[model samples]
Target: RTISKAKGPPRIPEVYLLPPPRNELSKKKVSLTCMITGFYPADINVEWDSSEPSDYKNTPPVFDTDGSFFLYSRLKVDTDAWNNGESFTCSVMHEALPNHVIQKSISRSPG
Candidate 1:
C-alpha cells in the first residue's frame, strides 16, 4: 500500500493594505489592490467588503513555487462611499485552515 502523509496545519495568509494613492480623484477610477500570500492547497478565494455598498472586484490568486497561494483583490467604492469614510475588508477562504480576514478603512490615508 502507498503511504499517505497527514495533512499539515492550515496556513495563515499574509495581508497588506496598499499605500494610499496620491491623487484621490484619479484613484477612484482604479480599484484598490490588496495582496494575500503564503497559503496552502492553492484553493483560496478572496472577498472585499465595505460598509457602504460593498462592491468587490476579485482577481485570481498568484501561486507560489512552494505550493502556496497569493491573491490580489480590489473594491470599487462609489465616490460617495469614499467620502463617507467607508470601511473595507479583505477576507481569505482556504480549505486547510481557518478562514482569515483583514480590515481597513478606505477613507483613511495610508501612511
Candidate 2:
C-alpha cells in the first residue's frame, strides 16, 4: 500500500482588521491581526503593505494534534494615517495558495 503524508500544505488564512481596545484608542494606534489556522508543514510567511510606516509582529506557529499548525501576525498602524484613509494590506504566503500569495486590505470607517 502507498503511504501519504500526515498533513498537506497550508490553507488560505482568515485575514481581517482588528481595532485597538477602547481604553487604548487614546494611544492612536490601530492593531490588525492575521489569523492563520488549520494548516500543515508550518513555514508560513506574512507581510504587510501599508501606505504609511508601521510596526509588525508575528507569533510562532502552534501545532495541533491533528498535525496542523496555526499562527498570527499583528500590524500596528498609526491612527492619524488610518483615519486619513491610509490603506493597509496583510499578505500571506504559503505553499497551498495560488501564486503563494493572498492579500487583504484594511481601512477605517468613514464618519
Candidate 3:
C-alpha cells in the first residue's frame, strides 16, 4: 500500500474582488464583497479609498471555514464614496505570513 501526506505549509489566502451589481435609480451606495480562500487564521481587513485621496473607513473582517483546512472572510461598505470613481481595496493579512496582500476593484457613477 502507498501512503500520502499533507504537502508543504498552507498557502496564504488569495484575495478576490467581486464586481458590484448595477441597479435602478442609480445606486447611491456601492459595496464590493471580497472572498479569500485557502488559508488559515482568517485574519484580514478591507478598506475604501478615493482615487483623489480622502477619508477611509475600515470594515471589520468576517471569518468562516468551509469544513476544511482553510478559512475565508467577507467585507462590505456603504458604496457612497465608492460610486464616485473611487478605488476600493481588500487586504488580507496574517501574523504568521509576510506582506500585506491586497486586491483593488474600481467603480464609477453611471452616465
Candidate 4:
C-alpha cells in the first residue's frame, strides 16, 4: 500500500489570445495563438471553435523553467475570413476550473 501522490487545487490557467505572426500574415495565410500559462498539473484540454476537427495543433503541455505549465494553441485561417470579422474561440478545460470553460476568442477582444 503506497499512497505518495499529493493532490491539491490546481492553479487557474491564464489565457491570452494573440494574432498571427507577421510572416504568415504576409503570405495571406494567418493564424492565431492562444497563450495559456501559469497552470498546474500539466493535464489540460484546449478547444477551438468554428473550425474542423482539430484545426489547431495538439501538442503536449510545456513545462516552464520558472514556475508552472504552459501551452500553445494555434489556429490557421484564411486572410479574407480573418478580415471579414470571423471569430475564433478557445475553450480551456482543466481540473482547476472544474467543468467550467475558460473561453477566449480571437479578433481582439477579451470578454
TM-score of 1: 0.63
Residue lDDT tens for model 1, 1-103: 2222333224544677774566545334545677777665545666666333556667776665664556677766545445546555666655554575666
Off by over 4 Å in 4: 1-9, 20-27, 83-85, 96-99, 107-111
lDDT of 4 by residue, 14-109 (tens): 567575433422435445666666566646677666365435775567665654666777776544545444455777666544544656544432
Point to the candidate with the largest TM-score: 4
TM-scores across all candidates? Answer: 0.63, 0.63, 0.47, 0.63
Mark the 10 consecutive residues where model 4 has the least summed lDDT: 1-10
| Residue range 44-83, candidate 3, lDDT tens digits | 3333332224334443443334422343333344434445
Tell me the number of clashing residue pairs for each predicted model: 0, 0, 1, 0
lDDT of each: 0.58, 0.57, 0.45, 0.56
Tell me model 3's lDDT, rounded to 2 decimals: 0.45
State how far residue 21 of model 2 sits from its true place (Å).
6.9
